[PDB]
Amino acid sequence: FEHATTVPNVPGIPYKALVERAGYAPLNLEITVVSSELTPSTNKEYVTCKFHTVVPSPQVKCCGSLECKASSKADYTCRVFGGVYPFMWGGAQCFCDSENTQLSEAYVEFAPDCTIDHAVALKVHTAALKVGLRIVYGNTTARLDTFVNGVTPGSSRDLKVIAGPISAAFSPFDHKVVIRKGLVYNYDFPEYGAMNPGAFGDIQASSLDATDIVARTDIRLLKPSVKNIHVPYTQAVSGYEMWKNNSGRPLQETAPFGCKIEVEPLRATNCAYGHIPISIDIPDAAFVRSSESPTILEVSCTVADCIYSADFGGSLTLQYKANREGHCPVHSHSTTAVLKEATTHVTATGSITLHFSTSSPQANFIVSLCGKKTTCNAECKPPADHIIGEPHKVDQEFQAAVSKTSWNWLLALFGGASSLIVVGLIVLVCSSMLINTR
Amino acid sequence: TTSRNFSVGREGLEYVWGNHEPVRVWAQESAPGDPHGWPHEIIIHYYHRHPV
Numbered sequence: 001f002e003h004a005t006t007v008p009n010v011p012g013i014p015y016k017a018l019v020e021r022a023g024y025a026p027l028n029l030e031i032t033v034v035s036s037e038l039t040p041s042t043n044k045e046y047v048t049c050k051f052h053t054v055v056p057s058p059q060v061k062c063c064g065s066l067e068c069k070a071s072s073k074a075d076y077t078c079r080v081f082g083g084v085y086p087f088m089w090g091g092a093q094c095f096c097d098s099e100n101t102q103l104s105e106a107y108v109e110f111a112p113d114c115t116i117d118h119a120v121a122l123k124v125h126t127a128a129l130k131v132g133l134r135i136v137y138g139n140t141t142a143r144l145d146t147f148v149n150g151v152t153p154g155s156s157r158d159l160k161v162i163a164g165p166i167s168a169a170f171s172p173f174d175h176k177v178v179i180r181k182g183l184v185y186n187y188d189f190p191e192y193g194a195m196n197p198g199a200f201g202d203i204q205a206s207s208l209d210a211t212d213i214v215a216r217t218d219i220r221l222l223k224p225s226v227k228n229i230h231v232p233y234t235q236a237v238s239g240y241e242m243w244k245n246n247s248g249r250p251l252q253e254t255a256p257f258g259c260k261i262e263v264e265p266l267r268a269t270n271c272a273y274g275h276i277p278i279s280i281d282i283p284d285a286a287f288v289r290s291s292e293s294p295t296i297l298e299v300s301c302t303v304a305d306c307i308y309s310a311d312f313g314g315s316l317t318l319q320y321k322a323n324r325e326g327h328c329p330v331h332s333h334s335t336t337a338v339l340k341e342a343t344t345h346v347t348a349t350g351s352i353t354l355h356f357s358t359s360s361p362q363a364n365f366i367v368s369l370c371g372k373k374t375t376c377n378a379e380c381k382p383p384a385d386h387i388i389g390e391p392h393k394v395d396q397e398f399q400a401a402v403s404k405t406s407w408n409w410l411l412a413l414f415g416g417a418s419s420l421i422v423v424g425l426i427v428l429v430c431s432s433m434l435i436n437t438r
Numbered sequence: 439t440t441s442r443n444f445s446v447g448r449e450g451l452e453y454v455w456g457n458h459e460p461v462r463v464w465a466q467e468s469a470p471g472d473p474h475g476w477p478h479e480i481i482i483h484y485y486h487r488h489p490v
């Protein structure tokens with residue numbers, strides 16, 4: 001058989017349901033979402049980190065001329081200077097009054113420690129969601145893990161269970177993200193091939209150990225103006241460091257729905273939003289014929305006491321008269337309330353209790369014990385303790401917070417002025433005709 | 439040391455402090471809603487929750 005059901009997407013909130021077939025007793029069916037897994041597809045754009053200014057010692061051509069030459073190194077800057085007078089601990093290095101000239105060049109390379117301090121830019125898209133389900137039926141449990149896409153089933157005991165698609169798409173990840181040292185940051189990193197000094201992505205390499213680098217960081221040389229030999233370079237502050245200083249809070253402290261984000265797959269986990277439609281197929285052997293199923297006679301409710309608590313605090317008792325010793329299922333077919341146990345023992349004339357969680361003060365619904373229904377109602381009071389972290393709202397509020405007394409007052413309030421106007425018009429026309437008699 | 443207020447959400451709130459793991463705290467209603475068989479100012483309850 002096949003049965004469809006909509007389940008809220010939230011961990012640790014079991015959903016109870018039944019399946020009805022003529023000649024077969026109901027089969028209790030519990031669905032639990034063990035943990036969600038949102039994994040988006042990503043593409044590596046580039047990697048960056050704090051850099052290091054290589055400054056090879058200046059070339060010196062003494063008492064003659066020289067010309068600058070470009071190179072393929074990143075941010076390579078070259079400049080000649082005539083009229084220089086190199087001096088060193090040994091004294092004057094070489095000799096011609098201003099005819100000499102020295103060539104100074106500089107470039108940029110990633111620092112060795114970068115091997116652990118790197119920050120990688122990424123582009124993400126097409127978020128996909130993976131759900132782990134645990135399904136219990138007939139005191140037999142099965143585990144499964146399926147893509148939320150509703151064309152691929154889960155493989156477990158050669159059983160096929162389709163799931164999804166999500167009702168409302170949600171993805172905390174933005175189009176551009178940046179990951180560094182296990183932390184995810186939401187940031188619009190500059191596109192590859194476009195640099196801007198003093199900002200993130202000043203140094204960009206296709207890979208951490210890529211011989212080819214592209215980067216511009218506004219390195220300008222200065223003319224030597226000291227006795228000795230010395231190449232003075234002026235440069236803008238490294239962009240990566242300044243991004244580090246004011247990077248803001250990471251994405252852990254901003255993701256809605258409390259998504260726990262892990263880096264090595266770059267995926268969110270264990271977080272709730274929307275609904276999931278799922279169709280479950282059950283092998284026929286699982287069902288048990290009603291002939292051997294216990295039959296309950298003269299069932300009756302009793303609400304010993306109820307509390308309109310967030311957690312599961314409401315109580316209930318049932319009195320039954322049966323004929324065969326066995327087990328039957330149990331459930332509450334009103335969405336406003338959820339029971340705790342699904343199957344229970346039955347005796348000839350025994351009575352049994354149950355714990356249930358509600359969400360409306362006027363706890364009135366039909367509870368089905370084993371093969372037969374029973375209506376029953378009671379009133380619940382709000383709880384004293386008004387803050388807890390345990391599972392809450394096993395059913396969402398459905399404007400059922402209105403009490404029966406409130407409905408009675410509303411009914412007694414509204415007046416039937418329509419009947420009054422109708423009677424007034426009728427008597428008006430009757431009197432008009434009577435006077436028209438004259 | 440000081441005291442800090444936090445408007446816990448109607449549906450939940452996360453709490454991180456120090457280097458130990460966080461805790462999740464949610465809320466429910468606690469106003470005196472249902473009457474006791476006599477006339478009562480029930481509106482106040484529904485004013486505390488869903489004031490609009």
Ligand SMILES: *[C@@H]1O[C@H](CO)[C@@H](O)[C@H](O)[C@H]1NC(C)=O
Pocket residue numbers: 138139326327
């Ligand atoms: C599951 O329920 C059936 C129905 O009463 C029972 O016969 C069977 O023994 C139960 N299985 C276990 C493991 O309790």
